[PDB]
Amino acid sequence: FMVSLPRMVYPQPKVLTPCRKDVLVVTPWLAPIVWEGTFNIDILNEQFRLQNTTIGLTVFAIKKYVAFLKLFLETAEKHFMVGHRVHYYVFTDQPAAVPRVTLGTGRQLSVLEVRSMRRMEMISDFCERRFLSEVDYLVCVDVDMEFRDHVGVEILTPLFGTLHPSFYGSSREAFTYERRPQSQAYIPKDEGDFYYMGGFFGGSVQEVQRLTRACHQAMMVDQANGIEAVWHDESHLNKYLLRHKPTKVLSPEYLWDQQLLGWPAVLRKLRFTAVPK
Amino acid sequence: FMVSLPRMVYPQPKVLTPCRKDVLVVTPWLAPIVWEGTFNIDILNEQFRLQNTTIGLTVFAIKKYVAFLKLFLETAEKHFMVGHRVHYYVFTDQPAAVPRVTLGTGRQLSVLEVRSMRRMEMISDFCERRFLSEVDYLVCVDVDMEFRDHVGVEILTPLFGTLHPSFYGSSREAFTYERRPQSQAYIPKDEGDFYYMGGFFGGSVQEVQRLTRACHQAMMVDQANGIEAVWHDESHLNKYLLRHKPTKVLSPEYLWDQQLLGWPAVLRKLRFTAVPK
């Protein structure tokens, strides 16, 4: 049950005035594509706080990648779901190398020791029960990253992917989908909506468990058949999201590499960005 | 659980090419606004058929308005949810005046005798149990209307309203909301997103029962306090949708009056239109 919003004073949306005329803001299956200027964060924050939403954020930091945790977490504290309940799940082979990061109120961090298929398997087959009890949404990201600007409840939806920053202007034939028919991740040259980045996806716990289970099973089939998809879990994520359309798509504001790609006019904000590795 | 879509060949959506640049296609709370050119009906039809979706359509035909049923129903057969399961619920004081309309396969009609608050009350407090057992979505419309073009699963969502054709270009101060603070339907001059038409709303059964229950209760409070909102159930619908944001908004393609308003360039299709009364 959803209680009523309170009175709010904000600018009237005008039907004969687009928020953005330079970009596609809705997919052909009626999923919003999230760009700056498309959302009123005050309305969305109200909606999600009234449900006491808890967001889980999974991140893997294995071997040398533990070095990325301090900046990742410190900048997540500045920019990720501020004001909402957050549970970080840090999967690592080196629990003692996890930095001690000071968290805002209503935020917690769990270190989960582990030791490819690991991310999809670990998210699905290992943590299924825990996530269902503890959070409403899961957000699953790469660690070699920093938050530079707001990443908030505008992303939340049953299932989302993120446009890979190298391919958002590309034709589908150029997408680096798995192209061998012998792989479960196979996508023909005449199929595909978008190329989604493996480093930022999420949704409700149920939909994320479905996605990660399916990708893990598909990767196991490929392993039994002696094939590894060209971009590993990202290839399988792309196959899944082709056949199970996401209910929002995040623009490349949400996964950018400034060193490689600069700061094009179409990006009003760079929210979550690559760190040199 | 949602099974995989089959392989489909369709044009690639291009992120740097909007579907429509002349209109707002997403609300500030990230709800699609449904216009022609924003959706691929083949993808949506697949998604909804894979769930074996059943759509209920409620219509009231009381006193002289029984005259409108033949055209309403015959044109619904041509244009409304064709290919999907449909259950019409015709509420009337004259069961014998309901015309015998030939239905396509997978479609059925029930005549419900009845004899203001009636529509909201009847939809909620009378048919709650039945609708939950029989349909997945409810669509609630005026009868003094005809279908001229496709009205399909692109509208389906947990909760939708429709932009009133007289006010889609208007500033909120001009909207004919109830303006007396003594009414439960009261909306101040500095609030409001859109003016929604009382003659076309819907959603999941649960969300429609919530809306109609709330509107009925609010109308009962007003009656006890000796006030009737300026536009009756439409005033209450507007108050509800201000405080409970719809998850899609239908453009005025979905509720038009050609005699009164012509055929503006911004409307590529006139789908559901007023009949002279």
Ligand SMILES: O=c1ccn([C@@H]2O[C@H](COP(=O)(O)OP(=O)(O)C[C@H]3O[C@H](CO)[C@H](O)[C@H](O)[C@H]3O)[C@@H](O)[C@H]2O)c(=O)[nH]1
């Ligand atoms: O030693 C490691 C290696 C990885 N990881 C973890 O895996 C994440 C992705 O790897 P990376 O960012 O290097 O690849 P990217 O080029 O940014 C990401 C892309 O390429 C990958 C392989 O290099 C995969 O194919 C992925 O699916 C694709 O998105 C990384 O952020 C770490 O959280 C770790 O903790 N320790």
Ligand SMILES: O=c1ccn([C@@H]2O[C@H](COP(=O)(O)OP(=O)(O)C[C@H]3O[C@H](CO)[C@H](O)[C@H](O)[C@H]3O)[C@@H](O)[C@H]2O)c(=O)[nH]1
């Ligand atoms: O004798 C009747 C009267 C009504 N009805 C039923 O009520 C529906 C709305 O009424 P109408 O279309 O005349 O008003 P509109 O001007 O098109 C619709 C608007 O004005 C209404 C009052 O006239 C309400 O305030 C409504 O909320 C608002 O949307 C009509 O389609 C019939 O299904 C019936 O069956 N028998």
Ligand SMILES: [Mn+2]
């Ligand atoms: Mn990375």
Ligand SMILES: [Mn+2]
């Ligand atoms: Mn009417």
